[PDB]
Write a protein that binds this DNA or RNA. Structure first.
Ligand SMILES: [Mg+2]
Ligand SMILES: [Mg+2]
Ligand SMILES: [Mg+2]
Ligand SMILES: [Mg+2]
Ligand SMILES: [Mg+2]
Ligand SMILES: [Mg+2]
Ligand SMILES: [Mg+2]
Ligand SMILES: [Mg+2]
Ligand SMILES: [Mg+2]
Ligand SMILES: [Mg+2]
Ligand SMILES: [Mg+2]
Ligand SMILES: [Mg+2]
Ligand SMILES: [Mg+2]
Ligand SMILES: [Mg+2]
Ligand SMILES: [Mg+2]
Ligand SMILES: [Mg+2]
Ligand SMILES: [Mg+2]
Ligand SMILES: [Mg+2]
Ligand SMILES: [Mg+2]
Ligand SMILES: [Mg+2]
Ligand SMILES: [Mg+2]
Ligand SMILES: [Mg+2]
Ligand SMILES: [Mg+2]
Ligand SMILES: [Mg+2]
Ligand SMILES: [Mg+2]
Ligand SMILES: [Mg+2]
Ligand SMILES: [Mg+2]
Ligand SMILES: [Mg+2]
Ligand SMILES: [Mg+2]
Ligand SMILES: [Mg+2]
Ligand SMILES: [Mg+2]
Ligand SMILES: [Mg+2]
Ligand SMILES: [Mg+2]
Ligand SMILES: [Mg+2]
Ligand SMILES: [Mg+2]
Ligand SMILES: [Mg+2]
Ligand SMILES: [Mg+2]
Ligand SMILES: [Mg+2]
Ligand SMILES: [Mg+2]
Ligand SMILES: [Mg+2]
Ligand SMILES: [Mg+2]
Ligand SMILES: [Mg+2]
Ligand SMILES: [Mg+2]
Ligand SMILES: [Mg+2]
Ligand SMILES: [Mg+2]
Ligand SMILES: [Mg+2]
Ligand SMILES: [Mg+2]
Ligand SMILES: [Mg+2]
Ligand SMILES: [Mg+2]
Ligand SMILES: [Mg+2]
Ligand SMILES: [Mg+2]
Ligand SMILES: [Mg+2]
Ligand SMILES: [Mg+2]
Ligand SMILES: [Mg+2]
Ligand SMILES: [Mg+2]
Ligand SMILES: [Mg+2]
Ligand SMILES: [Mg+2]
Ligand SMILES: [Mg+2]
Ligand SMILES: [Mg+2]
Ligand SMILES: [Mg+2]
Ligand SMILES: [Mg+2]
Lengths: 117, 47, 110
RNA sequence: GGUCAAGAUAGUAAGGGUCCACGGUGGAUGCCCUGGCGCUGGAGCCGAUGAAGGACGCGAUUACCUGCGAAAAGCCCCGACGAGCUGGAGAUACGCUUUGACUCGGGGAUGUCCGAAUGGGGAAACCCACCUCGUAAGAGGUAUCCGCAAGGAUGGGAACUCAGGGAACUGAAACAUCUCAGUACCUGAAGGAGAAGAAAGAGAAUUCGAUUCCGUUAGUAGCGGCGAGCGAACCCGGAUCAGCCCAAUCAAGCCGAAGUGGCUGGAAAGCUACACCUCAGAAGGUGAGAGUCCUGUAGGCGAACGAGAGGUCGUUGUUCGUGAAACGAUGACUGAAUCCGCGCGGACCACCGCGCAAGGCUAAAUACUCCCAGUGACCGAUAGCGCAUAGUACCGUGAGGGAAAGGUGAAAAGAACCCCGGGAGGGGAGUGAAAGAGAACCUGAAACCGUGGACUUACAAGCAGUCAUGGCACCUUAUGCGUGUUAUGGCGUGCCUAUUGAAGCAUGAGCCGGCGACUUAGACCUGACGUGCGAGCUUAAGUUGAAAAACGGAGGCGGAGCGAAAGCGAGUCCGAAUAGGGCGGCAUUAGUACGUCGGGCUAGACUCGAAACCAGGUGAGCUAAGCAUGACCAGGUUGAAA
RNA sequence: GUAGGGGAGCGUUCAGUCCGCGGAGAAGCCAUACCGGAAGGAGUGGUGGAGCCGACUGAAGUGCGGAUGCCGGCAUGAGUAACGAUAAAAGAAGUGAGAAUCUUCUUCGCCGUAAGGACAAGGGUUCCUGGGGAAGGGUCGUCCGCCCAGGGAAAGUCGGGACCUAAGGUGAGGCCGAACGGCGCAGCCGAUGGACAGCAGGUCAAGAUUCCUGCACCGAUCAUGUGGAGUGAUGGAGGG
RNA sequence: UGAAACAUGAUUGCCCGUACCGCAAACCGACACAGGUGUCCGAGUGUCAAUGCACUAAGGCGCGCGAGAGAACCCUCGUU
RNA sequence: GCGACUGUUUACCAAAAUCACAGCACUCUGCCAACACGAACAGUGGACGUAUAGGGUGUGACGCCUGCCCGGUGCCGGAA
């Protein structure tokens, strides 16, 4: 008995083309370029998952550095005197405190400096 | 310039025809081996 | 592929005979046999009805016009009748005379 | 609040982008069959009484097909059928037929011209005749060979068979013996089959007993640049049987049981409540799925006609390649005995066995499959034959090559009629269940072209993505982990193949569809899983039955090794024994048949791709020339011999 | 994690079997934010019009982006290049639904040992009449060598055969040869040649040494005559 | 004793080919294609003559895309 | 410079110094001639020609000419 593709291929293909939208030109419309575009897209997804884990960390950091400096502290010195008084805060939170909660950041500062000297 | 095919009725027939094709063995053979392929075009006699 | 093909090009009935429509819209109606086409297995009963338009055709008749006449049918919604009952009425074949062959029901004949 | 000043940001889209809606293009997919394909079985020749195959004709209108033959879609006779018929073809008018048509079976008659063509010629289907009879119109005859005559032969046939002739590529990783392989092809003859056949045989048992066929022996004996590779037979089981003579019943057809009511529906066959048939539940048609409508099936009948010698030299055949070369087989030379004789037993000799050369026929089993029928873990429109039909269209001077082609509906009820236009096309209407079927008429994918809408886009640098956030939009697996779109950021070297290394300026590719490549066979090899019997395991060919399978011990595998072999044997071999290799015990252990699979070998062996090689044929209407025959060169200048 | 070996599975068809759906609608197709570890598979909505899902088991033509792969369709290049000789066109008039292009008219331009005329070979209805306008026409077309229908072609003297032979092709007997076959005298086929009786005019929309008018020629068979004894081949010579 | 030859009258007259294109849009070149195709006839004026050249007659056409522009550049040609 | 000359040649990148030629030269060949096509004692060309003919080979009008080497190869002849 013979068994044409009949259906399967159109199936596979559409799957890709439905992943494949928003894509500029041919990419969103022809299979090969679509599936392809998606190979690379794969690479970018994986890496950029861990990557965003980096990037956010960076962001939090610069916000804290700011905070410290807003009084007279370095990031490194603030964070270090916040290791010294053992104030074991996540730094994401520290950003949050720093930019949305003023006088709190103030206190955490005075603390870090105290524990530093 | 001038071409391969310059028709000649007497040539055509005295060359490819039926008295001609039957005059030789391999032309009998051409004949029936054509017939088998269901030629309407048996031979240039049949033009 | 012919219609009488699978019906041994066989007309179980005849030109003249009364008929009753088994299955269809015309469920049960009476009709003399006006036209019985065996090969195509098609046939005309005075029932059916139809409105046909016979197009421009200037001769005869300049304008078109229409026509109430009737569409033929398939000898498989055609049914022979039983004089008594008059309905869904099979047929047996018997012999009256004298090498004349005939046709009964479960109570002959027709 | 007006003026001026500094600073910030908005909107427009020529066009484009993403998404969305809506068509177009195209004809994938699903469904379907009106066409295939294979296997089993049946059937199997035609023709001088004109074959296959054609040409031209026959029609009220006739281009193609079909049927036919100037008696021309037909004619006579018989038989079945009994109401319709007037070919596909779907068109009018003409008609025919219950005194029996049409269709079917069975014979007959008529059958132009070409074609073995056959009165002679010819470029097939055309030209010109002579003879006999006729009043003419017509009819017959006029080939050649075997024959006294009567009579037979000629040509065609897909394969199947026999014969004369007989390749190469290939493999041996080169080639030449060799292998391909007596294969491809050519030719001759012949049949429904053919061939072969009634022993100077196999042979080793003082056994069998014509042949052909299958199983098996058996990849054993052997062949071989002993390399590649090549490879029997006797016996044993089956199929089917035969041995004779001469020279001193199917083919046309008929007949066949048993349901209705309501319900949905455009439509009942489906749902349902109660029914009956069955030797009949195989199938197909009917508005959607019918045991009980129809045609049928199980069954029963069934026709006038109808069918049932030796030797020598060069060589070769079998497993037979000069090898110890037997034997047959023939080309050339030689050409013995006929019974107290002849031929063979693989050189050769005796012995001892099997055999009757020089004369013929022979059914049966076997091979094939143009054709007919039945079936199918065969195809359904890129499949399947090349063809849903066509060897046609088209290409080719020729031989030869050679396509894509499918679908309105249940039924034509095929759209009278009004509207814009010459039309084409469309918008109504009307039919239908549906015109979301309208004749470019089933679904209608994708590339591809457009209209509209959302959000965006004119200081911007880009493998076109990702990931984060803001904007805007939307709310039928959907108000949150949202969806569409977007701005800004970070980040980021298409895919494949080929490689030391690919974004590569290295290969491939316009895009999307659909077709596209690791298989099959053998009762071979060897393994893994599994199973059934288990010191035991197992059939093959066949036979019978066959909506199933059973029978079939003939042979196969295990049983014991060792040597070169004879042979010996839990031993054996080398040798004179020793000392050892192989082996048995062992300190112990299982086989075999099936099946699924991982590998192997032989054959195309994963698919595609050569340049080349060989056979048979087709081409000198092109070009190179030959031959026979015709044709052709305004006008002018120069001024040889004699 | 590359070549590679191993493990478990996803989907496609055909098949056996069961669960079972379907005109209150099957498959196929279309949309989507659901589910599964993945091959994948469900829900609902729109399409469609008559068939099909699921489980288990069996057998495969069983999963494509590539092969400068094959078939087909549609894109790019692009509204680009080109419209096929630089012999050249104007105005009026007409027709038509529509005209630079078709039909009249009046001019202009080109060929004129041709770009005129008559034949042959080849082609095959392309000729003439009336009509048509899808496509063929390199634009347009009302037009055409395209489409439809109907008509048209006439021979004793032209040309070929009923006569001849060349090259060549044949060819009973004949000479050869594994077969098919290869030769081959006479005879026969074979025009490109030999032979041979008619010229002048007229006319259909379309024929012309054919038909028609006028006046000829050649062979053949019969008859009345001049008859009044020779006719003259399958061989001879001349001639051609 | 009807042999030829002849005159005249009668009478007879087979078979195919004849359209049209045929130096081309109708044949061979895939095409309504600047090619190829064999023989005949092919007027006049001027010119030593002529089938030569210019221009003409009879006849046949203006070759089946048009219109405008008046740059680069390209082709064929004039003058320098 | 090359060829003497008229001629010929690579259809579709080479027309010449190519090739042919008249001329000369070596040999071969006595007729069923050599030589050539050939299933082949066929038949055919050679040729219905006959050594002033026919084949093969080379040079290449014409003019003055064409030397030296016979060991190897070929060829002709010889014979113990
Ligand atoms: Mg980290
Ligand atoms: Mg716009
Ligand atoms: Mg016919
Ligand atoms: Mg009768
Ligand atoms: Mg009947
Ligand atoms: Mg008759
Ligand atoms: Mg004849
Ligand atoms: Mg070889
Ligand atoms: Mg080899
Ligand atoms: Mg035969
Ligand atoms: Mg011997
Ligand atoms: Mg041998
Ligand atoms: Mg012997
Ligand atoms: Mg399809
Ligand atoms: Mg096909
Ligand atoms: Mg209309
Ligand atoms: Mg838009
Ligand atoms: Mg800037
Ligand atoms: Mg901007
Ligand atoms: Mg790949
Ligand atoms: Mg490299
Ligand atoms: Mg690049
Ligand atoms: Mg590249
Ligand atoms: Mg490379
Ligand atoms: Mg096992
Ligand atoms: Mg096994
Ligand atoms: Mg393999
Ligand atoms: Mg199933
Ligand atoms: Mg299905
Ligand atoms: Mg592809
Ligand atoms: Mg490329
Ligand atoms: Mg433009
Ligand atoms: Mg451009
Ligand atoms: Mg431009
Ligand atoms: Mg242009
Ligand atoms: Mg033009
Ligand atoms: Mg012009
Ligand atoms: Mg006027
Ligand atoms: Mg008008
Ligand atoms: Mg014009
Ligand atoms: Mg002319
Ligand atoms: Mg005309
Ligand atoms: Mg046009
Ligand atoms: Mg008009
Ligand atoms: Mg001959
Ligand atoms: Mg002539
Ligand atoms: Mg004459
Ligand atoms: Mg004549
Ligand atoms: Mg006359
Ligand atoms: Mg004609
Ligand atoms: Mg033109
Ligand atoms: Mg031309
Ligand atoms: Mg003249
Ligand atoms: Mg003149
Ligand atoms: Mg001139
Ligand atoms: Mg003209
Ligand atoms: Mg301007
Ligand atoms: Mg100057
Ligand atoms: Mg020269
Ligand atoms: Mg050249
Ligand atoms: Mg040249």
């Amino acid at each position: 008995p013979r068994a044409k593709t009949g259906i399967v291929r159109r199936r596979r293909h559409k799957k890709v083309l439905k992943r494949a939208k928003g894509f500029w030109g041919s990419r969103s419309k022809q299979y090969r370029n679509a599936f392809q575009t998606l190979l690379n897209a794969a690479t970018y997804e994986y890496r950029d998952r861990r990557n965003k884990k980096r990037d956010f960390r960076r962001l939090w950091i610069q916000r804290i550095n700011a905070g410290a400096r807003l009084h007279g502290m370095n990031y490194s010195t603030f964070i270090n005197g916040l290791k010294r008084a053992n104030i074991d805060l996540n730094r994401k939170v520290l950003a949050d405190i720093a930019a949305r909660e003023p006088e709190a950041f103030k206190a955490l500062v005075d603390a870090s400096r105290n524990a530093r000297q | 310039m001038k071409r391969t095919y310059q028709p000649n009725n007497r040539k055509r027939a005295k060359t490819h025809g039926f008295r001609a094709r039957m005059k030789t063995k391999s032309g009998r053979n051409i004949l029936a081996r054509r017939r088998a392929k269901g030629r309407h075009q048996l031979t240039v006699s049949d033009e | 592929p012919s219609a009488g093909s699978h019906h041994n090009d066989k007309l179980h009935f005849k030109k003249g005979d009364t008929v009753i429509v088994l299955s269809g819209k015309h469920k049960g109606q009476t009709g003399k046999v006006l036209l019985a086409l065996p090969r195509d297995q098609k046939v005309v009963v005075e029932g059916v009805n139809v409105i046909t338009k016979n197009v421009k055709p200037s001769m005869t008749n300049p304008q078109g016009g229409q026509e109430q006449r009737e569409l033929a049918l398939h000898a498989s919604k055609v049914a022979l009748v039983d004089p008594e009952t008059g309905k869904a009425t099979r047929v047996r074949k018997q012999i009256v005379d004298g090498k004349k062959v005939r046709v009964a029901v479960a109570s002959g004949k027709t």
